[PDB]
Amino acid sequence: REILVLHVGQGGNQIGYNFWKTICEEHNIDIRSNQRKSVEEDKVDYKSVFLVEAPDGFHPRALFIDLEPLAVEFLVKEMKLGSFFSEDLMVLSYSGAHNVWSIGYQTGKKLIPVILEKIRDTMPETLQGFLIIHTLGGGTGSGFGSLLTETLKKEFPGKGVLNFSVLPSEVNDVTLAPYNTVLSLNHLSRFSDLVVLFDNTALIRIVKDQLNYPVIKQFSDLNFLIGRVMASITASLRFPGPLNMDLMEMAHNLVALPETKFIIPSVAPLTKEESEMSTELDLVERCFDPTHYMVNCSGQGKTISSVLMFRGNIAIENAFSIMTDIKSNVAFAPGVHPDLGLKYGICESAPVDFDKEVTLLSNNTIISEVFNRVLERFDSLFNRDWYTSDYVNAGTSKSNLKEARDNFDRIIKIYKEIEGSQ
Ligand SMILES: Nc1nc2c(ncn2[C@@H]2O[C@H](COP(=O)(O)OP(=O)(O)OP(=O)(O)O)[C@@H](O)[C@H]2O)c(=O)[nH]1
Numbered sequence: 001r002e003i004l005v006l007h008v009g010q011g012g013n014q015i016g017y018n019f020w021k022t023i024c025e026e027h028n029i030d031i032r033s034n035q036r037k038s039v040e041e042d043k044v045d046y047k048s049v050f051l052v053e054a055p056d057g058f059h060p061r062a063l064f065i066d067l068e069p070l071a072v073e074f075l076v077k078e079m080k081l082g083s084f085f086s087e088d089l090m091v092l093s094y095s096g097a098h099n100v101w102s103i104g105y106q107t108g109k110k111l112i113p114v115i116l117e118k119i120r121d122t123m124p125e126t127l128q129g130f131l132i133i134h135t136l137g138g139g140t141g142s143g144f145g146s147l148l149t150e151t152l153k154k155e156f157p158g159k160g161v162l163n164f165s166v167l168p169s170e171v172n173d174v175t176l177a178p179y180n181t182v183l184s185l186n187h188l189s190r191f192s193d194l195v196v197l198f199d200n201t202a203l204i205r206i207v208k209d210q211l212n213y214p215v216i217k218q219f220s221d222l223n224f225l226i227g228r229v230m231a232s233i234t235a236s237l238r239f240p241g242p243l244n245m246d247l248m249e250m251a252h253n254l255v256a257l258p259e260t261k262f263i264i265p266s267v268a269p270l271t272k273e274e275s276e277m278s279t280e281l282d283l284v285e286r287c288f289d290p291t292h293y294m295v296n297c298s299g300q301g302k303t304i305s306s307v308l309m310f311r312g313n314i315a316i317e318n319a320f321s322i323m324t325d326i327k328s329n330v331a332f333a334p335g336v337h338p339d340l341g342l343k344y345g346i347c348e349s350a351p352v353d354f355d356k357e358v359t360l361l362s363n364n365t366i367i368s369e370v371f372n373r374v375l376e377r378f379d380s381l382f383n384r385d386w387y388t389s390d391y392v393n394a395g396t397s398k399s400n401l402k403e404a405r406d407n408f409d410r411i412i413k414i415y416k417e418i419e420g421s422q
Pocket residue numbers: 008009010011012014015067068096097098099100135136137138139140141142166168169173174177200203219220222223
């Protein structure tokens with residue numbers, strides 16, 4: 001059940017700080033010492049899923065990859081997790097991708113041999129899959145992340161390749177993001193087994209309103225929610241539970257058609273103060289709400305398939321009691337059976353910061369509208385040949401951009417066909 005994590009680019013590596021901090025905290029480890037705070041939970045946990053053991057200290061089964069060092073360096077020195085984020089786990093170059101998917105895809109091909117050799121060292125043959133954490137708007141996380149997704153699926157067929165990819169804010173903070181996002185989602189639609197999507201617009205709004213935290217100057221607290229989703233969906237692998245599930249079990253339950261592998265996540269509660277104030281169904285209803293969707297959505301949309309991970313103070317009586325109320329309040333696609341569309345997972349271990357928790361992975365048709373807005377941005381640049389020159393002069397032809405564009409458009413049509421039923 002072992003999992004190897006790959007962080008690519010500034011965003012992917014910065015997110016890795018909050019994820020491994022939450023993983024360490026859930027396993028009673030202070031991320032900095034690499035040593036146990038307590039042995040109290042070691043015997044009801046399975047630390048081997050994400051953590052590698054050593055007398056000097058725990059090590060994450062992860063690689064930290066970037067085509068420029070500043071993002072890793074400044075994070076590993078400010079938070080200063082030198083021992084945990086051992087630098088034998090870093091694969092750094094110094095070119096940068098300059099926000100071009102093609103430059104990242106290919107400068108990365110130079111480090112594929114050293115990344116692959118570090119993988120075969122780290123991985124036990126009982127490894128179940130990989131997690132790839134990256135942003136889609138930049139160049140390294142998008143291009144190199146696409147390359148690693150393609151590389152791992154062919155280097156290790158039969159093993160799972162899951163992607164946790166960050167979309168830009170609705171008003172893009174990178175003008176080249178539509179090109180980079182379309183190119184990456186095209187690569188991932190092929191080589192990924194499951195793509196859990198985030199966008200900063202939804203994350204910024206959750207942080208501003210739902211947590212109402214004083215103020216933020218690091219992506220830290222937006223990345224905390226991304227780390228909460230990754231940790232909670234893997235909780236039943238690392239802690240006892242009446243109903244556990246692994247990476248491919250969740251992907252099999254979500255991917256109805258081979259191309260419907262793009263997932264919207266949500267978690268409740270986001271503040272400890274409401275963990276006291278909520279029941280099982282209330283956490284479920286709020287997860288099925290746009291105010292908790294970590295992707296900018298209109299409404300609940302039409303759910304094709306969903307996975308619900310229950311953690312902590314969770315009445316299984318009530319968890320199965322409210323399944324009728326779930327289908328009663330959540331609109332599902334016109335082709336989904338009234339008794340289907342749900343995949344349950346129950347882990348007895350509570351999250352780091354809440355008394356109960358419900359994590360939702362939703363295969364929703366509303367992702368077609370999110371993708372449609374990315375496509376419309378793509379076309380406003382592609383139809384005017386704006387910024388295409390350095391994609392052309394980095395070896396991605398317009399012909400390759402158009403090929404990725406129409407395959408991306410085909411995915412939008414598959415989701416809309418499930419949505420409309422006309
Ligand atoms: N949620 C979140 N988003 C981030 C973070 N860092 C960067 N981003 C987003 O990622 C997009 C750009 O990707 P980056 O990761 O910064 O760039 P890169 O992957 O290192 O690629 P290059 O900079 O071109 O070498 C921007 O739209 C940012 O909003 C982060 O730490 N958390």
